[PDB]
Design a protein around this ligand. Structure first.
Ligand SMILES: O=P(O)(O)OC[C@H]1O[C@H](O)[C@H](O)[C@@H](O)[C@@H]1O
Length: 294
């Protein structure tokens, strides 16, 4: 009866729409939360008969190390998706566009200028910047790729890491920045928005050197007795009306062509974000990049 979803998303983003799916389709949805790679690693070791049914969130098209744990499937509505961000991974349907961001505490900042990654290296900020474990999280990994992409120099990654404090959990970064434990941190757009809209002194910075754009994905998990409504769930999550609801309520960035663009207040439209072009981000497997920067 229960349909289990694995997701690194925070509850506030996905619990409501999953409740509306419960209300429309009369299925109970339980969420298993965790860091992207921790979820994938525990799923891999999870017994085949106990597994959940859907994985949503994270850059799945690029960081699924065990494709045998998933079913080859893409929703038909990929036809309606933005041309540049369709999954090239037969196990993954693109779901949302998630800019990675720098978050700055605007009560501690004072006159310190923070426009991007280079500014984080100012001596006054040493040891007062936070990021999440690149080995276990989408957000930390994507930021390390963004720093490497500037000049394709591992030394740039190491220089940042020697300047900053690594935390286990991506959401601890925004929490501790918002609460004044750190001057700034490496986060992602929706997590930063959540805390700014709760009134915390948080500024959202799209790094001028190049902002990584995560293409979040959805995948069907290989298990013994798949819940027969899981393909309806993927359809629901990638549908126009549901994507439009996520844009309207959260300033999400829809994967679909036929859905509004909304970037209220300090959130930026993609056209005003300096995105790292794909040409600066070549093919290098997840595990090889982590080995490169170790
Ligand atoms: O804890 P994480 O592995 O960093 O995942 C938390 C979030 O961060 C990433 O940047 C992805 O864009 C999101 O889809 C994901 O839900």
């Amino acid at each position: 009866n229960v349909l289990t979803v694995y997701s690194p998303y925070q509850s506030n983003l996905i619990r409501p729409i999953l409740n509306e799916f419960e209300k429309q389709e009369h299925v109970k949805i339980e969420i298993k939360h965790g860091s992207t790679q921790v979820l994938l690693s525990n799923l891999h070791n999870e017994d085949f008969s106990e597994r959940g049914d859907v994985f949503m969130g994270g850059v799945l098209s690029e960081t699924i190390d065990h494709p045998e744990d998933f079913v080859p499937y893409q929703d038909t509505s990929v036809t309606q998706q933005l041309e540049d961000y369709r999954s090239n991974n037969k196990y993954v349907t693109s779901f949302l566009l998630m800019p990675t961001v720098i978050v700055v505490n605007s009560d501690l900042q004072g006159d310190i200028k923070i426009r991007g990654y280079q500014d984080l290296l100012q001596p006054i900020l040493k040891g007062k910047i936070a990021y999440s474990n690149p080995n276990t999280t989408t957000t930390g990994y994507q930021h390390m790729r963004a720093i490497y992409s500037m000049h394709h120099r591992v030394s740039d990654v190491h220089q940042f890491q020697n300047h900053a404090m690594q935390l286990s959990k991506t959401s601890k970064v925004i929490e501790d920045v918002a609460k004044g434990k750190y001057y700034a941190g490496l986060s992602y757009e929706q997590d930063a928005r959540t805390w700014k809209n709760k009134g915390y002194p948080v500024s959202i910075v799209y790094p001028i050197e190049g902002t990584m754009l995560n293409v979040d994905g959805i995948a069907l998990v290989k298990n013994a007795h798949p819940h027969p409504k899981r393909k309806k769930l993927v359809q629901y999550l990638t549908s126009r009306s549901v994507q439009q609801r996520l844009v309207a309520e959260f300033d999400a960035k829809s994967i679909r062509k036929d859905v509004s663009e909304q970037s209220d207040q300090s959130i930026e439209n993609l056209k005003n974000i300096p995105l790292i072009p794909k040409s600066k981000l070549p093919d290098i497997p997840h595990h090889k990049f982590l080995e490169m920067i170790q």
